[PDB]
Structure 1
């Protein structure tokens, strides 16, 4: 386990090195019983300036900034994400580019094992996250990690060559192994406990957003076509036809059994940082997607 943080772009090695640095750093700060308010204003900044040392993959000079490290450690736990697992996802191999999953980010990436999405964002995106973080953390507590909201894992600032780049890490709305064949953006037939739980969450989530005074978020719907997933292959964890681990792929619903094609759907609220009144937007949102299901 000699970790070369090797990537196609310098910026990605720096990311891989920072996540490795900050997670190790945190493995030495005790897990508190509660988070204090200080933790939401907090950060760690680290400037590196190597000289003739360890420069075969990293640049010789970079900064790395981790926003609110104690809070995102907690959120990781509440989302059932073990820190060492996060660390390995970002560090074992370089993050590889991904298709967009929102209007929010300027560049979308995935970790080699397709678990976590990494989004390049603006400084005002960083600041809006800081604005919503305590209530969001509160919300994630009250709801036990069971949202359709983006589930935030990390937030960073990297400087390479005097160029600053902000990044947010989330769990992938899509699968880590089933391909999403079609994405729909909404500003489908399932099981009844699925529909019930979906609409439970959706009301609870949309309510939250309205109370933060947020509008113009959308619903990302992705679709996995099983018959096509067989067919695009003809010419190690098991899994059958349209099967998935729901603790990993937490936005996935399988299509109803007595229903046409076997499909898997991925539904999540996206675009909560950058962008009728919000309460009105909330009520409309509920009702729009109530009709759309089963």
Structure 2
């Protein structure tokens, strides 16, 4: 069975079809250059058949099936785990920010996020995809960079929709009590918005800066984190990357307890290194940080944005 929105049903049907389809096409010894130009396209038109959840006519297109499929194993994700996260239960909405873009979804299990990109972006992914993949080859899938697991284009009512599935920054288990969108840019737009008075506000640079923000990772982990950062922002620099920021999610354990308790009261802490990473445990007082670089796709010119982004983040940690 499928979802609510006909597009969410065509998505589940698509990631299911494409992944199964891929289960029969053998894993190559290496990715040829054509694999970064290939794609799969499917046009369905069922008459009086199978329509209790799917549109009678729709199209589904998967960009570079082989390269993302490899990017998946490279990020240690089992295709079938990927498939079930998307087809088991319809993907719930998260919060599609009030600006550039359209929507932000997340699988029922909160593990993967489905961002609806633009035709422009889908073209950017293709330009960068080859280099980015080679980068991922020599990092062993260890980066604060978004780990792209798949990119699709669904069409319903002749309306094309582009999407870019990616493992989320925040964990699928633990809750993000306080969030941030550190751009690192020299003082411009970065503060009080209606957001501050929202469900979960996306505070910016100066908000975080004035809060004398506590981010004690240690001296062992802060090193390893900042060293990733150095090579990422440097990679992006190698290829003109447009205004990207660092996503910051904070999880207060003690607060989590209380919330968890009330839930248990009405009837009457740990991330997972691999299966929900990007997490960072606090040196002392119970907290977990979630940090990773974010809008790699799409006022001074960005090559200089690198050193600034790293220098801003270089001071956060302790």
TM-score (norm: length of structure 2): 0.82
CA distance in 2, matches of 1:207, 1:169: 24
List gaps (5 residues or longer) in structure 2. Answer: 184-215
Q: Is the 8 A contact 1:102 1:271 kept in 2?
A: no
- Note the alpha carbon deviations across 1:126-182, whole angstroms, 9 max, x for none: 000001000000011111100001000010000011111100000011001101111
Report how many residues are paired: 282
CA distance in 1, matches of 2:145, 2:23: 28
What is the SS of the residue equivalent to 1:46? strand
- Match for residue 30 of structure 1 among 12, 26, 31: 26
Between 133-142 and 282-291, report the one with greater CA deviation. Answer: 282-291
Between 139-148 and 249-258, report the one with greater CA deviation. Answer: 249-258
CA distance in 1, matches of 2:48, 2:82: 30
Alpha-carbon distance, 1:253 to partner: 8.0
Change (3 A) 1:101 1:200: farther
Change (3 A) 1:215 1:9: closer
TM-score (norm: length of structure 1): 0.89
CA distance in 1, matches of 2:23, 2:167: 21
1:118-137 superposed matches below 5 A: 118-137=114-133
Change (3 A) 1:50 1:196: same
Change (3 A) 1:256 1:83: closer
What is the SS of the residue equivalent to 1:73? helix
Change (3 A) 1:268 1:257: closer
What is the SS of the residue equivalent to 1:274? coil
CA distance in 1, matches of 2:9, 2:242: 36
What is the SS of the residue equivalent to 2:127? helix
In the alignment, structure 1 residue 163 sits paired with structure 2 residue 159: yes
Please name the residue that 1:266 is paired with. 290
Q: Is the 8 A contact 1:148 1:267 kept in 2?
A: yes
Alpha-carbon distance, 1:246 to partner: 9.3
Change (3 A) 1:209 1:254: closer
List gaps (5 residues or longer) in structure 1. Answer: 236-242
